């Protein structure tokens, strides 16, 4: 299966996040790193982008997910706000799944959409900038989790967020 | 809980 080779972009990462040495993994620490505050860096929300974004075409990757609450992942428009506390909503240009309250959610607004998908281990993300959609599938049977249909009007970046300790996200391949 | 997501 042809998947994009992605690495987490340390210049974007919230300083509380810990990125693995291979730049595939992210979790939350309780120590803020002393990092330079670039305009691209998420200074309050616990977010990081991949270093690669996309303006056209179709792209796949997979995300290995922790069993416990605290993560959300998907894609963000490049213009996603980086500074101060921002909402985690489609209006803010984030299109994500989340594990919170021991429930899986598609992060719709104003109310999140609870998913009855069973336990998740690894999720395939299918980003389609030709038709305007981002879809999520559980890898065991490729059951469909959710599709956001979006007329994306800018470059779209893989998005990861971890807002509590005790969980993680990891990029494959 | 997810305020900072």
Numbering used by the authors:
A (entry chain A): -2 to 170
B (entry chain B): 3 to 7
Manuscript excerpt for this entry:
TRIM7 catalyzes the ubiquitination of multiple substrates with unrelated biological functions. Here we show that TRIM7′s extreme substrate promiscuity is due to a highly unusual binding mechanism, in which the PRYSPRY domain captures any ligand with a C-terminal helix that terminates in a hydrophobic residue followed by a glutamine. Many of the non-structural proteins found in RNA viruses contain C-terminal glutamines as a result of polyprotein cleavage by 3C protease. This viral processing strategy generates novel substrates for TRIM7 and explains its ability to inhibit Coxsackie virus and norovirus replication.
A more recent over-expression screen of 118 RING E3 ligases (including over 50 TRIMs) identified TRIM7 as a potent inhibitor of picornavirus Coxsackievirus B3 (CVB3). Restriction required PRYSPRY binding to viral protein 2BC, followed by its RING-dependent ubiquitination and degradation. To test this, we synthesized peptides corresponding to the C-termini of RACO-1, CVB3 2BC, which was previously identified as a possible ligand, and both MNV NS6 and NS3. For 2BC, Trim7 PRYSPRY at 13.15 mg/mL in 150 mM NaCl, 50 mM Tris pH 8 and 1 mM DTT was mixed 100:1 with the 2BC peptide (NH2-TIEALFQ-COOH, 100 mM in DMSO) and crystallized in 1 M Sodium Potassium Tartrate, 0.1 M HEPES pH 6.8. Solving the co-crystal structures of each complex revealed that the different peptides are bound in the same PRYSPRY pocket, with the penultimate two residues responsible for most of the binding interaction. In each case, there is the potential for hydrogen bonds between the terminal glutamine residue and TRIM7 residues N383, R385, G408, Q436 and S499. Investigating this further, we found that mutating the C-terminal glutamine in the 2BC peptide to alanine abolished binding. This suggests that interaction between the glutamine side-chain and Q436 in TRIM7 may be necessary to position the carboxy terminus for binding to R385. To confirm these results with an independent method, we tested all of our 2BC peptides for TRIM7 interaction using differential scanning fluorimetry. We only observed an increase in PRYSPRY thermostability upon the addition of 2BC peptides ending in ‘FQ’.
